[PDB]
Amino acid sequence: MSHHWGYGKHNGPEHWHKDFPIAKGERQSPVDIDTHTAKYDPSLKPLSVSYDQATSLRILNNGHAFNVEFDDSQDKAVLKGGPLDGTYRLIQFHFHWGSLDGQGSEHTVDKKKYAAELHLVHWNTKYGDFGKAVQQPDGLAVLGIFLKVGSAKPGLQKVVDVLDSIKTKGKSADFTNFDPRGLLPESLDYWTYPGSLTTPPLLECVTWIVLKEPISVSSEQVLKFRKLNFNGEGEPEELMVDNWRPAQPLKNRQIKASFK
Ligand SMILES: NS(=O)(=O)O[C@@H]1CCN(S(=O)(=O)[C@@H]2O[C@@H](CO)[C@@H](O)[C@H](O)[C@@H]2O)C1
Ligand SMILES: [Zn+2]
Numbered sequence: 001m002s003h004h005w006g007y008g009k010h011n012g013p014e015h016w017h018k019d020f021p022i023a024k025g026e027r028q029s030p031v032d033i034d035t036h037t038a039k040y041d042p043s044l045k046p047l048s049v050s051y052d053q054a055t056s057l058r059i060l061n062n063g064h065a066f067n068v069e070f071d072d073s074q075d076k077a078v079l080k081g082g083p084l085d086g087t088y089r090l091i092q093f094h095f096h097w098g099s100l101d102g103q104g105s106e107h108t109v110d111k112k113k114y115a116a117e118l119h120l121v122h123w124n125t126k127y128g129d130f131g132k133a134v135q136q137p138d139g140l141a142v143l144g145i146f147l148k149v150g151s152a153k154p155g156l157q158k159v160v161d162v163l164d165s166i167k168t169k170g171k172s173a174d175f176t177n178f179d180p181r182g183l184l185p186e187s188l189d190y191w192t193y194p195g196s197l198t199t200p201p202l203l204e205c206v207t208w209i210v211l212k213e214p215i216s217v218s219s220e221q222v223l224k225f226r227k228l229n230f231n232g233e234g235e236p237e238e239l240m241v242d243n244w245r246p247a248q249p250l251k252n253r254q255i256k257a258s259f260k
Contacts, residue, residue, distance in 0.1 A: 155182020
């Protein structure tokens with residue numbers, strides 16, 4: 001591990017366990033979603049996505065992906081219902097994507113990989129702050145949304161057009177008044193299971209909610225993702241591509257479906 005962990009040959013997912021032993025734990029993410037094995041659970045409530053008062057602040061290239069950050073000091077953008085007990089506040093979203101359209105998602109569906117995957121990260125307000133929440137088995141809820149390449153996603157374009165300004169690791173830009181509702185598909189049908197963060201520290205603190213319906217983005221939109229850099233300014237260019245962890249063993253877990 002050079003600096004530290006990453007997605008390259010010498011510091012990628014196969015290496016992570018040496019510094020983060022929980023990498024080989026009992027509820028690691030992502031996983032393959034076997035649609036024929038997932039069971040419909042009629043006791044699952046509809047998801048409540050309440051993003052009308054969302055306050056985006058900033059977008060950051062963190063050397064792994066880019067994060068769009070939100071004001072989470074109040075209940076402005078929250079996720080509730082579904083498998084969740086209580087209220088989860090949106091803190092950021094980010095993506096994972098590939099070097100080619102046939103790979104890039106972290107979760108897979110009957111072993112199918114999508115071109116990318118969007119993660120909207122939320123923390124359980126009963127734990128007071130994000131740092132405390134990640135130390136709890138029900139601390140986080142991540143809403144995962146698949147991306148396929150086809151027609152453009154209009155609500156994604158504002159994100160795409162600011163990426164030139166955060167090309168390299170550590171760069172940030174003002175990113176206020178962005179509406180994350182524009183990134184959602186029509187349907188909120190989902191699969192859910194207990195899992196983990198998919199990068200180090202790989203903490204097993206996440207209730208995963210993965211939407212069945214992918215969104216479509218254009219080839220031009222995803223091409224601009226692939227022009228980002230893992231490296232910092234003034235360093236040799238390493239294109240930011242294939243920043244996804246592969247599917248992990250399901251072990252003693254059941255994936256539940258919200259839909260028939
Ligand atoms: N893929 S996931 O399961 O949704 O987890 C991602 C990756 C890890 N978290 S995180 O700890 O909140 C996140 O991780 C860091 C870098 O990987 C920070 O740069 C950053 O401050 C950030 O808020 C979210
Ligand atoms: Zn993620």
